[PDB]
Nucleic acid binder design. Sequence first.
RNA 1: GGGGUAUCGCCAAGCGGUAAGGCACCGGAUUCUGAUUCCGGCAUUCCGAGGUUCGAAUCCUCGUACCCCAGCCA
Length: 529
Amino acid sequence: TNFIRQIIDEDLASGKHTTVHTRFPPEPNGYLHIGHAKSICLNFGIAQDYKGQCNLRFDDTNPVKEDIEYVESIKNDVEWLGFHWSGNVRYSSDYFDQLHAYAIELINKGLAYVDELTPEQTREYRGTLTQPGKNSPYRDRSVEENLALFEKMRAGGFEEGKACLRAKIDMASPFIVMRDPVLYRIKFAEHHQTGNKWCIYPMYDFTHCISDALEGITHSLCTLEFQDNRRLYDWVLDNITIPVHPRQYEFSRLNLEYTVMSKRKLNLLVTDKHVEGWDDPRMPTISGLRRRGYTAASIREFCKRIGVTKQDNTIEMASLESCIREDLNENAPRAMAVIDPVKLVIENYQGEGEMVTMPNHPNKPEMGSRQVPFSGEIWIDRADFREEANKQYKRLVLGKEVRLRNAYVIKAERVEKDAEGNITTIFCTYDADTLGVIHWVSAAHALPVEIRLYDRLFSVPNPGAADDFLSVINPESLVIKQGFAEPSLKDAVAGKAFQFEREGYFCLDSRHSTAEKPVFNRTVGLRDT
RNA sequence: GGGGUAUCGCCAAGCGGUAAGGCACCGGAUUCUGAUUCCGGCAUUCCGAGGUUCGAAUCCUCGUACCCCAGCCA
Ligand SMILES: Nc1ncnc2c1ncn2[C@@H]1O[C@H](COP(=O)(O)OP(=O)(O)OP(=O)(O)O)[C@@H](O)[C@H]1O
């Protein structure tokens, strides 16, 4: 339970409400991100918990920043997380004629006027954070005059910025938001829903409260920056004929260590091609997380974990990463692949190669078993062999034995070096009556596989607070490798996390994999210690 | 000037009766993944100073710190 639910409980009990109706309202100007997921889980979660409704409403009030691509991707991610909205998808643009009708009521009551101060001037008259503002010389036009000027606006008679509609509140109010907040501005831009029907568009504050009222939203939940704004919310609803008055409650937004959430910024990474696109696996976007191999259930857990408070905060990746590991550890069928490979032959081995039965899950027999080809000329990961080591090192030293995964206890004997002091191959003896551990892959039966080792995108924890977040990108956010994996991975499906034993949970990258050359994104590493 | 917030390294319960939980972390026991699983340890102390009370993280003063607002963006 959190503060928002205690409020809802009181509301139900006191008989203030009988049903709860929330909404998630993203603007379609970018893909959704892990931050949005916190709001989604909150809004849609309360609905199903209290057997209530939650609308998906696209706040599409600014046509020059939104695109249809986003509305489709947004609907996509919402479902993927496992949530369904109430009834049909809604749009603020759905209320354009209603909004305009309400602007007129405001005008008719003298609570709004068409101002003509330029954009620079409007800023000047607004005062500062310590100095009150001042009434525009156009502030006292007659209702009749305002009706005329507004229709001129509506009818495209004014250039952009040459006139706008404003609420007539208080230029000296300590709330900067109540100093005659603009209600309509001219934009001769094709809207993705209403095409060119409109050339004057409503501002967020005017649109949002009226839309919540019309939809019968019982609790408008959004982030902390809107606490001041709440005053305008109520002011609008108090001066127009509407029969309900939704209440807004604010909770703090999610900040994740090492990542930027600002869609402006995420947009820069994409536009400047510093990442593949919105769903690149290093992005904090829901679709990127998906491609990265996270699971809708792991994200819901994350939300469940971070809580909901008024407290500003920054979660460490350790918490996110914890969630996906827990999920995958339980449901991921284990398999084997070698990322950095150095050849290892067993001379002692006689035969064209046998077959070893390995479990799909070392702790869950229920998940079945499989037939993995063993051999003499195998593949091993470089860092597993040590020509020289100490008691700690529990892998393959040039003097002792090491158990192969689910196979034979081999024994290191004779190395062979590459001219440049490197190791070309390892020769070891095997003990036919054997069946630390190390993973392997029969050279003869090995499947060529690309591996994409992903790390955090930024090299500082709050790249946001940097003078130039771009200059603080991690150059090792993605490190590609060519390795080998057992042939069963021949049947991996896009997004189906496997646990490459002793490395990390990996998943087939849709975007890149092909027939011969599959591509595996490393979702998250294993607890290395 | 206004609106907000202050509990462990990072989250977070608490709502006058004596500091939950989770992530990280340190042990130790199993383990053919240095994984998983188990065991145990991690706030006499709740931004600071005063005060009320039998008892205060919780009430009341008085400070201090941080966040948000001056888009015809949301
Ligand atoms: N980081 C966040 N943490 C929690 N909730 C968020 C976060 N960012 C946005 N939201 C919520 O998502 C809802 C939709 O956000 P919307 O896409 O309209 O704008 P925004 O993401 O705040 O701004 P921007 O488009 O500049 O990123 C908002 O009502 C807000 O409460």
